[PDB]
Amino acid sequence: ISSQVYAILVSHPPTPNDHFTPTPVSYTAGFYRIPVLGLTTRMSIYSDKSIHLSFLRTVP
Amino acid sequence: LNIAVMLGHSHDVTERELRTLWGPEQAAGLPLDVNVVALLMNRTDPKSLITHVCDLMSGARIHGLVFGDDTDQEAVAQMLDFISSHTFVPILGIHGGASMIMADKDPTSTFFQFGASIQQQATVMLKIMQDYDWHVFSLVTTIFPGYREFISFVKTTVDNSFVGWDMQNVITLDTSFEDAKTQVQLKKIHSSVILLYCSKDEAVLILSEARSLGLTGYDFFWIVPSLVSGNTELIPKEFPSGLISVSYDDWDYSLEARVRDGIGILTTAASSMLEKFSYIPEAKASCYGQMERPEVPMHTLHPFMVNVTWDGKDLSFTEEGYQVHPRLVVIVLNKDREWEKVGKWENHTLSLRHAVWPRYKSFSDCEPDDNHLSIVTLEEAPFVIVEDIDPLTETCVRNTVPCRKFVKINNSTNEGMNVKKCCKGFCIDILKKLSRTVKFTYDLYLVTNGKHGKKVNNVWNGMIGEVVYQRAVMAVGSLTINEERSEVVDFSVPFVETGISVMVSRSN
Amino acid sequence: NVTALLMEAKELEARVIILSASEDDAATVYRAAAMLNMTGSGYVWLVGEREISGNALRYAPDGILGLQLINGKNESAHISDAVGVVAQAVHELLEKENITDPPRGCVGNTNIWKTGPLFKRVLMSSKYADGVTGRVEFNEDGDRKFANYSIMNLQNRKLVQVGIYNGTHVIPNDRKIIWPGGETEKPRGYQMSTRLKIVTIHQEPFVYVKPTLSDGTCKEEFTVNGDPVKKVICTGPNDTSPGSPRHTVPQCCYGFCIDLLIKLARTMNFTYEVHLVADGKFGTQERVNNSKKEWNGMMGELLSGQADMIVAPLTINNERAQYIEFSKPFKYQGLTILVKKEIPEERITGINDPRLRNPSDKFIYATVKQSSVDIYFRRQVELSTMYRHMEKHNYESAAEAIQAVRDNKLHAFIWDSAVLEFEASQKCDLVTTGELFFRSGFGIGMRKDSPWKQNVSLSILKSHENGFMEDLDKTWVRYQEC
Fold this sequence. Notes:
The structure is cut from a larger assembly and holds 2 copies of chain A and 1 copy of chain B.
Chain A: E1 8-9, H1 22-31, E2 36-37
Parallel strand pairs in A: 1-2
Chain B: E1 2-3, E2 5-6, H1 16-20, E3 35-36, H2 46-57, E4 65-67, H3 76-86, E5 91-93, E6 111-112, H4 118-130, E7 140-141, H5 147-159, E8 171-172, H6 182-187, E9 193-194, H7 200-211, E10 221-222, E11 244-248, H8 255-276, E12 328-332, E13 372-373, E14 376-377, E15 384-385, E16 401-402, E17 422-425, H9 427-438, E18 441-442, E19 445-446, E20 453-456, E21 459-462, H10 463-468, H11 483-488
Parallel strand pairs in B: 1-3, 2-4, 4-5, 5-6, 7-8, 9-10, 13-18, 14-19
Antiparallel strand pairs in B: 11-12, 15-17, 16-17, 20-21
């Protein structure tokens, strides 16, 4: 955020932990309503624009 | 048992020792180490918030933190859960931004708000609907998060109730302020009570659009959820004078009381946990440090949070994570563009503060209320028969009309509890038939002093005294036509004939 | 331990499982179904994508069907597609009127970048079919729509993919898709399992109930033409008095509904598990204690998956008809009143009589607390005083009702016309005052799913057309006069 980004990308780490990273980045960038994109995280809670504000992913 | 409290820095930004001096002689018993390490807040940012909490955590073995933010950044609540996600330190917020509910939290963390859920607000709404005999409504919803739960709940409750609601069409504005289907949707509303649910700006826009369509007037009752009731001093120009929206208590339940209650809750929970077994919970090593692994032998104080009392207060946070007995008070806009307060909600009762709803001026530029007649009657045998509301679905029987009345408790005491009861008979049937064909509303009440009418000392008592004083139009009841009565007050043409009769019969 | 769930699932008709959960839970359920021999014939199985990956793929039985997204654990393709979409959206937005800058620094400035919500709104809808994943178009909820899956079918620990789902367009592939066990067919789902049970209630000549004789069989009786009477042994309760030590001792079961049931059984070749109803009610639904509409008695048991068919006196009511499939009416009886015949007085013309319209203290009438009479009365809100009197003097059955009206404890009795006529034909002490109204043809209702509704309807229609019921009426009820 120190470089005034416009849309962050997010992807799973090499070692799996189901949720891991999308939750922190989603919350933090959702403070300022900066839309983010998912790339692999296909788990169902995220598709709820009331606990995650702004989150668009690219896998059903 | 050292805990910390972050204040709001706005209302009571002074005397940190005053907060630190809670329960000076004896707060709740002070079992082992009841001490406050409360700090001060400021403009909150996720970096600053995380930094302050992590710094404090690597301090004097901090315990459950009470949060009292004053600003409304909405998402802040979520952030709080995140901290409780990855540091097993229970946390609860009371006032401000960490007050609006968030619903499903992570089952591996503890964080309990103190606001009102959607379901409780909807239930109080339907209760305020049924307590005034308004069993017809049509609701319009925008596309905003949470509409699915609201619609599903309102659909589930209506058909599981025996009140007999006439719930009409629901409306969902697919496109906002486009008037393609929104305009015709708004037009096809034949009811009088509308349960709008939307965002503040969306609600303002919708009300502004609908005002010019005539959907507002002396009989047009909007009710909106607490979300629409936002700032207490930002009433817009599109808000009609008089509308009902439930909200959390703000005029009462001062901040100090909430803080003291929360500290007492935490102390009692810690005492119960210690009494269960003597194994104190150790704080986390360092949030800023290395990675963390699950090492708690059992849930330290999560199960020790439900079923807790404190000097009458019965706060009993549910498994979802909110209070089961919220202090909800329904408010209504006054005639001076200020929020009034009417009716609390203590155990389950509405405890409303108006026997009859006052017809409020919808606007300074609106048609006058020229279709309401305050009819009156007198209790006779064959004309009107009074009764009381039955306990089952306590509104009234589905075969008559509610007639308010004045009852004096005992004789010496002039306790005028205007009881709500419903009555039938003969004249009321004709009144209903007439009102159907002449489309006028009525809030009728029984006569108080005397019966029938008489020119006693040149002043009339009964229904005649009411009409002769321009206090109540219409006096429907068993009234006999008389020349003096006709001279004083006008009559209409008769419908049922009668006269003087002699009641003498045969003994055998 | 999930043995209970599998055990409960075993005794069921449908033969299709849709397991969808975590990998370890899938392994546990696989072990359970292996132990309980659930993986046998006619058990086509469907499984979620995760449940055939990792440690789960070592214990699953041969025969399952699995599905999976094609471009899955890949990142280069997804990165390329996402960058394309984001660039397209930014270039589209930047030609607007009032655009701010992203908030520099995450300490301090703590406001809402309004162009952020605008950006999300515009980015929500932007088709871009120029990337190696397929055309990409986000849906309304904020996800990815129009993907394609591959349906791999397990075959001797060799995942062989067949068919492709390209969106509402499932197109198969040439391969003999084995089913668990090695069979080559389209197995089967629903199963008949003709051990369906009858639950009934004792009343009228329709049902004849008495304690069974200790010889194992009730008795060896006959009829007018010396024909032995068919009987069964139901196992209903014998504790009609509250507080008794209920034992459900079997009793005699030799009514008329048993004759109909036996005729239908010889029409359909099935078995039964007859037993009476504990409480006993036509289904007068009520409200639970300080909490949704609650049914009761025979109807409540029937809806609660207990009774399969409910052949009994079942006067058709819209309260029952909301969720039930009635069969063809096998009876035509109305609602009629009955009073004790005097040893000048006028016959009361039912509710049409104004005297019966206005209750009086000397006119104490009551039918029952549990029947369709009360539920019909509640529907027609015109005579609430009579309904209140009926409720405040309600009885619990018809035997004590007729006993009470025998000694003038009550003053009237409204019931089915046939029941009253039969009662007054044998013990001709009372009369048959009143007319018939609310004529409801007795039906046979079922749950919304049943493979016998059409069959029972056609069978009862054929029996009515050939007059088989008339012979039973002659030989069972209309046989005496005084």
